[PDB]
Amino acid sequence: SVQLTEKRMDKVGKYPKELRKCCEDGMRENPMRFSCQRRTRFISLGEACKKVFLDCCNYITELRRQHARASHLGLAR
């Protein structure tokens, strides 16, 4: 979303330069409505990369939900 793209960049920045792809992919849209843990199960690609993915996924999932709630309540930022 609007300010969501922002908090994503800030989050991706927080990580060592070679774990940013993992973070980025952890925060892509979720049309199949899979849990964060479920989406890691077949990426392989590493242990330290799964921790990153999972952490960024959980981070952005919470932010999307908070955003959906604000939007539903007409507080929409």
Curated annotation (Swiss-Prot):
The record marks 76-77 as: Cleavage. C3a is further processed by carboxypeptidases to release the C-terminal arginine residue generating the acylation stimulating protein (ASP). Levels of ASP are increased in adipocytes in the postprandial period and by insulin and dietary chylomicrons. It is found in: Secreted. Residues 22-57 form the Anaphylatoxin-like domain. Disulfide bonds join 22-49, 23-56, 36-57. The modification Phosphoserine is found at residue 1. The record marks 73-74 as: (Microbial infection) Cleavage. Mediator of local inflammatory process released following cleavage by C3 convertase. Acts by binding to its receptor, C3AR1, activating G protein-coupled receptor signaling, promoting the phosphorylation, ARRB2-mediated internalization and endocytosis of C3AR1. C3a anaphylatoxin stimulates the activation of immune cells such as mast cells and basophilic leukocytes to release inflammation agents, such as cytokines, chemokines and histamine, which promote inflammation development. This is C3a anaphylatoxin. The lineage of its organism: Eukaryota, Metazoa, Chordata, Craniata, Vertebrata. The chain holds residues 672 to 748 of 1663 of the full protein.
